[PDB]
Amino acid sequence: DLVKTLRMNYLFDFYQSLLTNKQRNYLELFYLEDYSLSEIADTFNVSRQAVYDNIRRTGDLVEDYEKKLELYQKFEQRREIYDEMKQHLSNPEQIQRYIQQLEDLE
Amino acid sequence: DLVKTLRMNYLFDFYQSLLTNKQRNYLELFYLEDYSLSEIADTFNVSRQAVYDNIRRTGDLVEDYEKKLELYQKFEQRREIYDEMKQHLSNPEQIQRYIQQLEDLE
Numbered sequence A, B: 001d002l003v004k005t006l007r008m009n010y011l012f013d014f015y016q017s018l019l020t021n022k023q024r025n026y027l028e029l030f031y032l033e034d035y036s037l038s039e040i041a042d043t044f045n046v047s048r049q050a051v052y053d054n055i056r057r058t059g060d061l062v063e064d065y066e067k068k069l070e071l072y073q074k075f076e077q078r079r080e081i082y083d084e085m086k087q088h089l090s091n092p093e094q095i096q097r098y099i100q101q102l103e104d105l106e
Helices: A006-018 A021-032 A037-044 A048-069 A071-085 A092-104 B002-018 B020-032 B037-043 B047-071 B071-085 B092-105
Strands: none
Touching: A006 A021, A006 A048, A006 A071, A006 B047, A021 A037, A021 A048, A037 A048, A048 A071, A048 B002, A071 A092, A071 B092, A092 B071, B002 B020, B002 B047, B002 B071, B020 B037, B020 B047, B037 B047, B047 B071, B071 B092
């Protein structure tokens, strides 16, 4: 069900501005601050079920944004390309083809 | 206005997937295809006023997405750096600096 993964930290970083303050605060507490559902429920004095549905729904919204905008998938491929380019700084042909790949993934 | 029209044309490809079907179709017709409000209202058999209100909210929404995510601005900055790199393919130190510039953008 809910899993604290690297992916969720990145999706939040990319899409947090698109959320409401309440949606952001639920994900900040759970994923960024590593609170448990019970700790959040006690902080907001709401039921655990309520906390779970709020985090589940908001997480699904962020995944929906990623499917539409693909910012994390594009960032991941660019990061891989930058690392490879940093291994071929002295080869014009390699750099040229990596620039092409950076343009094509857009 | 002209400026809003130009902006909707630059920003549409980056954010159209976030819009509802109605928001997307009305924005396409008004800003990309130059239909009048009455023509759009007749095309979809709806209130000219509802169309005006929808387009007004949508135009503001799209500019707000660019203010928050900067996808068009960043795509164009990356485009310029890629083009600058193409002019220094034999300068290892310079290429390394451009990659640093790109990493600072993300």
